[PDB]
Amino acid sequence: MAAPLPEGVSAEAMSSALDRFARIVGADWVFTEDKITPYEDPYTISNDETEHRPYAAVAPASTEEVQEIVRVANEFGVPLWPVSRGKNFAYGGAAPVMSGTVVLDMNRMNRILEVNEEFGYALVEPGVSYFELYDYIQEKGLKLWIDVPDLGWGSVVGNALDHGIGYTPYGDHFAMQCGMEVVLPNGEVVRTGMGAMPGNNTWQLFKYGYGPYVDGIFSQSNFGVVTKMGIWLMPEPAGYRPYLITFENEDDIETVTERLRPLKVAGVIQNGATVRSLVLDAAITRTKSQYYDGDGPIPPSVAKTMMADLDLGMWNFCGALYGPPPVMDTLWTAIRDSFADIPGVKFYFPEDRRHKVDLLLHRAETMKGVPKLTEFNFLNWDGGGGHVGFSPVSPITGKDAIKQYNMVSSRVREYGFDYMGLLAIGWRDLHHVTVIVYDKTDPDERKKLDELFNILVDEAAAEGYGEYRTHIRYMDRIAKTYSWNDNALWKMHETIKDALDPNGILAPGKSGIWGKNRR
Amino acid sequence: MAAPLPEGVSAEAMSSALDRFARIVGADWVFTEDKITPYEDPYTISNDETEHRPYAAVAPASTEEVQEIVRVANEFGVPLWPVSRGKNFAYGGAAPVMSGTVVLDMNRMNRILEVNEEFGYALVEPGVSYFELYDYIQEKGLKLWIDVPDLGWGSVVGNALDHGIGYTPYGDHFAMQCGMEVVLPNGEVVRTGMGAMPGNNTWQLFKYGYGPYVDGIFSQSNFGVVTKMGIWLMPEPAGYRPYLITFENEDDIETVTERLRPLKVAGVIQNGATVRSLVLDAAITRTKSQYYDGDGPIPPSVAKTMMADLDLGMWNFCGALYGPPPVMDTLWTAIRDSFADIPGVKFYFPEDRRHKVDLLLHRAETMKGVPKLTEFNFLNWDGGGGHVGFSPVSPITGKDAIKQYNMVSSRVREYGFDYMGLLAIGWRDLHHVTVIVYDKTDPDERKKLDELFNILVDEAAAEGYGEYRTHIRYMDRIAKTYSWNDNALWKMHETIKDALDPNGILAPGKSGIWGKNRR
Numbered sequence A, B: 001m002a003a004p005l006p007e008g009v010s011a012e013a014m015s016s017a018l019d020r021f022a023r024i025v026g027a028d029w030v031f032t033e034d035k036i037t038p039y040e041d042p043y044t045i046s047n048d049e050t051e052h053r054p055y056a057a058v059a060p061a062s063t064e065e066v067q068e069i070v071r072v073a074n075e076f077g078v079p080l081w082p083v084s085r086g087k088n089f090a091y092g093g094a095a096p097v098m099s100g101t102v103v104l105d106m107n108r109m110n111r112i113l114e115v116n117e118e119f120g121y122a123l124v125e126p127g128v129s130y131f132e133l134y135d136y137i138q139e140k141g142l143k144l145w146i147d148v149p150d151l152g153w154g155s156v157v158g159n160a161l162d163h164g165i166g167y168t169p170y171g172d173h174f175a176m177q178c179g180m181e182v183v184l185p186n187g188e189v190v191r192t193g194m195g196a197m198p199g200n201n202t203w204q205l206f207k208y209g210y211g212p213y214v215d216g217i218f219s220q221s222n223f224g225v226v227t228k229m230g231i232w233l234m235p236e237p238a239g240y241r242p243y244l245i246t247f248e249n250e251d252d253i254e255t256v257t258e259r260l261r262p263l264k265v266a267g268v269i270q271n272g273a274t275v276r277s278l279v280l281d282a283a284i285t286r287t288k289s290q291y292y293d294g295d296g297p298i299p300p301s302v303a304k305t306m307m308a309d310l311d312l313g314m315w316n317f318c319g320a321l322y323g324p325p326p327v328m329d330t331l332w333t334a335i336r337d338s339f340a341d342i343p344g345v346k347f348y349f350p351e352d353r354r355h356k357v358d359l360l361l362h363r364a365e366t367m368k369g370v371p372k373l374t375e376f377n378f379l380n381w382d383g384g385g386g387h388v389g390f391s392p393v394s395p396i397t398g399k400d401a402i403k404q405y406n407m408v409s410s411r412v413r414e415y416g417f418d419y420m421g422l423l424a425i426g427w428r429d430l431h432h433v434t435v436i437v438y439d440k441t442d443p444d445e446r447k448k449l450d451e452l453f454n455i456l457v458d459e460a461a462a463e464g465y466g467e468y469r470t471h472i473r474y475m476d477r478i479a480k481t482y483s484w485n486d487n488a489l490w491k492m493h494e495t496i497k498d499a500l501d502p503n504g505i506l507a508p509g510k511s512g513i514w515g516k517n518r519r
C-alpha cells in the first residue's frame, strides 16, 4: 500500500513541491514511491498500513539547499521530517509521525568542518557518523575520544538532538553540545552562542553567547533544522580501566542502586556507567535457543544456567576508571568497597573474563568511545526481530529501580517477551531503557507489542514516571503524560511552534507538537 | 527628578495598574515616590536623570501573586522588570533598561523548598540568598557545598539566570540548574523537565524531561518570570587545598594561558579557578594611597613595590584541589610542573602566606562556597566608587588573553582608571571580567567611563570578541555586536518574544529584546 498524501495537501501541491525539491538538490536526490523503502520504520509496530508512511525523501548537500527546501515546503504546505542520518532504530528509524510527510535526509551533508585537539571539540554536519568522526580522529592522530551511543552507524548531531546517551564521561550527548547552525521554519539561518558574533573564535568554546540560551529548543523538537553543531570531545586520558561487577539476585538492584547514588553524585563513577539485566547482556553473545526450547520468556533454571555459563549476574554493573593510576586506584577502592558485602557479588577486570567473545571486552571498547555494531546482536535473541525502547526515567534510588523493574519485567514477560533492561547512570538519574525484541513481520506479535507499550506508558505515568524519549507512534501519548497544570508546557510549545512555523511544515507530531493547522 | 511614565502608558493606566497591584500583594508591598530609591542603579553611569528610572516596585509573596501582577500588566500595558534579589551591582542593580518600567521584586519569595543531601540539590524561590542557603545547610549539618559568585547577598536563582559564575567545580551556575517553574508573560504557569509530569520525583534529578529543552530561554531573558528553580550542589569532598601561583611579568599571561588550557580541558584544574591582575588582588587588602600619591593609575615602580610588599604577581593564578589526598597530590604535581620553569614564578599554600589578612586566605573561603561580602573591598582602591563590568569572552589561548589585556588595560588607564582584570576559567573559555572602579557621584568621571565602555565594546567586537553579560545601559549595543547574517539571532528572539509576550510587558530592553510594540 502506497503512502497517502498528507491531509490538506493536494496531489498538485505535492507534485509541484517535489519538482522544486529536484531542482534544488538534483533529480538523483528526490526519492518517490519505489525508492521510499529505506525511509520506512524498519521495526514496524502498526498493523494499519496507512500509518507513519513517508510520501518521499529529499537528500540535500548544503545548508543553502535545506533553506530552499524549507521555503518550497512553506509555499506548498508540504510537511518535512528532518533527519541527520535517520538511524533512530527502536524509535521509528527515518519514518515520520504523520503519513504524507516528506523526509528531509541530511546524510550527504557529511563534512567534518573541524576537529580541534587543543580545545577538544568537533564542528560537524548532520550526516557525519560516529564511525566517520572516529576514523578522522585516528587518521589525523588526534589525542581525543568520542562518545558512542553503543551503535556507531548514527549521527553525532541527530543522536544528541534526540537527547541520546553513551558510556564515557561525555555520555550526555546533548550536554556536550556547543554552538549550532539552524534553518528556522521560515528558511532563515541563525547561529547560536558565540556563532552570532561575526569573526568570533569562540563558537565551540562558550555555550551561551549573550541573551536567551536557545540551543536546547532545537532538541527533541520541530522548531528548526540543525545544519551544523559543535560538540566537546574528551582528551585521551592518562589511563583507562574497565570493570564489571555482577549480582546473583533480581532483588539486589535495590541495594545496588542505593550504593550507586553517592558514588555517582560525587563523581567517583566517572562515566555513564550501566547496570544491564542478564538477558540484555547474554543476548550479545548467545540466543535463547542455545539454553531453552520453550516459545515464551525464560524460566529461572535457564537464567541460572546462562549466569554460570557466561559469568553474568541477574544485574551487571559495567563502568570504567579514567586518569592517572593513583586516581584510578583511589576511585576503585571506593567503588569496590561499596559492593563487596552483597552476598553473591563478583568482580571482573577484562583479564578475569574466561570467554574470548565476551560482553565486558565489547563494553571496554564502548566506554572508550569505539564505534561498533555489536549491540544489534540482542535482536537475534528469539530468532531475529526488531525492537522498541520503553525508556522511563528513575531517581538513583533502589525503591524506584526495583519498582520499575517489577512493573516492566512483569508486563513484558506476560506479553511473551523476555525482559532486557538497561539502567544508564546519569548525573542524578537513571535512564531505564527496556528494549522489547519482537517479530516485526508478525501482525499478532505487533498487536501484542502495541498493547504492552500502551500499558507500560500508562502504568509508569500512574506511578509518576515519564519517558525521556519514545517512538514516533507514541509521541502524542508521551506528551499527554507531561500534563501538569492542564498541559501548560505543551500549550507553551505550541505557542512557540506557531511563531516559528506558522505553516506547520516542520515534522508535525514530533514530541507531540503539531501546530495550529493540525492541532 | 521623578521617573517618567513609560512611553504609550497614560497616568490613568499606571494609576489603575498600581491600585490592582496593591489589591494582589497588599498595600504594604507596592513602592512609589520616596520608597523607590533602593531600585535605582547604585552605580549611576548616565548623566541623563530620565534614563534607567523605575516608576514603582511590587513585592509579591507567591507564584499566584506573580501571575495576577502579570495579568494586570497585560490589561494596562504596564511593563515589569523582574528581579530575584535585585543585587545585580556592576550591571544596573535592580534598575530597568526603560524608564517607567515597574520592578517586580521577588525578594519576599524566599522559601528553601528542599535541600536534598542524598542527591545533592536545592529547590529554591528567587529571594533565597547564598547566605540563606549556606546557613540552612550549616544549621542542618548537611554535607553539601554551595557555589558563590564572590558575593553572598545575591540570589541563587537571579545570578544563575544572568549566567553568573563562581569558583568551585560547580562554578557555571546556570549549567547546574535542573527544573524551573515559570510564569509566562500571559500569566500562565509552567514547569520544565520532569516537573511537567504530575506526581514526579525527578524534577531536580533529570534536566530535559521530554520534548524541546527550554530552560535556557528564560536565562538572560524577558520571556518569563522564574518563580522556582532547582540547582545541583556539590557533596562535601574528602579534602580541599587552595593555592596561589604568582607571575612577575605582565607578559607572562601569554605562556600562563597556554599552560592552563590542557589542564582545564582535561579537568586537572577542578574548579572555576581564576587569574587576577595585581591591582584587583591588591585592592582586597590595600588602597592606592598606601603606595602612591598621584590621582591617576599606578606607574610600574609602584606595581613592583606592591608585588614585593603583598607577595602578589602582576598575574595571580588562584585555584583549589578537591578530593582524597592521593587525588589532590596527583593533580597538584601536574599543575605545579606546568608553571615551574617560568622565571619569577612563586607557589603558595595558605601556610606560606605571611600576611594575616591576605588574598589567598580570602579566596580559600570563596573556593569552598563560603558566602562573603569582601569582594566590594576593591571599590576602596581610589577612595571609594562604583564599578561596571566589561566582560568579553576569550579562548583559553595566550594570544587572545594578552591581546584583550593590552586592549583593555591601555584604554582603561588612558581614561584615568587602574586595570583590574579577572580571567575566570570556564570549561573551554575565559570570562575576562574587567572591573572599572569610578566615582559614580562625579558627572565628569561618569562621562569618561561611558566613553571608555563604548570604545572597549567596539574594539573587542572589531577583534571578534563579545561580552557574556552587560549593564542595562549597554544591552542594545551588545545585542547589535551579535549581528551575524543581518542580526538573524535577534530577529528570532523578537519572533519568540512577540509569541510569548505580544503586549511586551516583560522587561522591555533586557538583552536588547523589545517586542513589536517598542522595536
Ligand SMILES: Cc1cc2nc3c(=O)[nH]c(=O)nc-3n(C[C@H](O)[C@H](O)[C@H](O)COP(=O)(O)OP(=O)(O)OC[C@H]3O[C@@H](n4cnc5c(N)ncnc54)[C@H](O)[C@@H]3O)c2cc1C
Pocket (backbone or CB within 6 Å): A082, A083, A084, A085, A086, A087, A088, A089, A090, A093, A094, A106, A126, A148, A149, A150, A151, A153, A154, A155, A156, A157, A158, A159, A161, A162, A163, A164, A165, A166, A221, A224, A225, A226, A227, A375, A376, A387, A507, A510
Ligand atoms: C540495538 C539498539 C541499540 C541502541 N543503543 C542506543 C544507545 O546506546 N544510545 C542511544 O542514545 N540510542 C540508542 N539506540 C537508539 C538509536 O538507534 C540511536 O540513538 C541512533 O544513533 C539515533 O539515530 P541517528 O543518530 O541517525 O539520529 P537521527 O535519526 O538522524 O535523528 C533522530 C531524530 O532527531 C531529530 N533530528 C535529527 N537530526 C535533526 C536535525 N538536523 N534537525 C532537526 N531535528 C533533527 C528528528 O526528529 C530525528 O527523527 C539504539 C537502538 C537500537 C536498535
Ligand SMILES: Cc1cc2nc3c(=O)[nH]c(=O)nc-3n(C[C@H](O)[C@H](O)[C@H](O)COP(=O)(O)OP(=O)(O)OC[C@H]3O[C@@H](n4cnc5c(N)ncnc54)[C@H](O)[C@@H]3O)c2cc1C
Pocket (backbone or CB within 6 Å): B082, B083, B084, B085, B086, B087, B088, B089, B090, B093, B094, B106, B126, B148, B149, B150, B151, B153, B154, B155, B156, B157, B158, B159, B161, B162, B163, B164, B165, B166, B218, B221, B224, B225, B226, B227, B375, B376, B387, B507, B510
Ligand atoms: C564587587 C563585585 C563582585 C562581583 N562578583 C561577581 C562574581 O564573582 N560572579 C558573578 O556572577 N557576578 C558577580 N558580580 C555581579 C553581581 O553583583 C552578582 O552576580 C549578583 O549576585 C547578581 O545579583 P542577584 O544575584 O541579586 O540577581 P538579580 O539581580 O536578582 O538578577 C539579575 C537579572 O536576571 C534577571 N532575573 C533575575 N531573576 C529573574 C527571574 N526570577 N525571572 C526572570 N528574570 C530574572 C533580571 O534581568 C535581573 O536583572 C559582582 C559585582 C560586584 C560589584
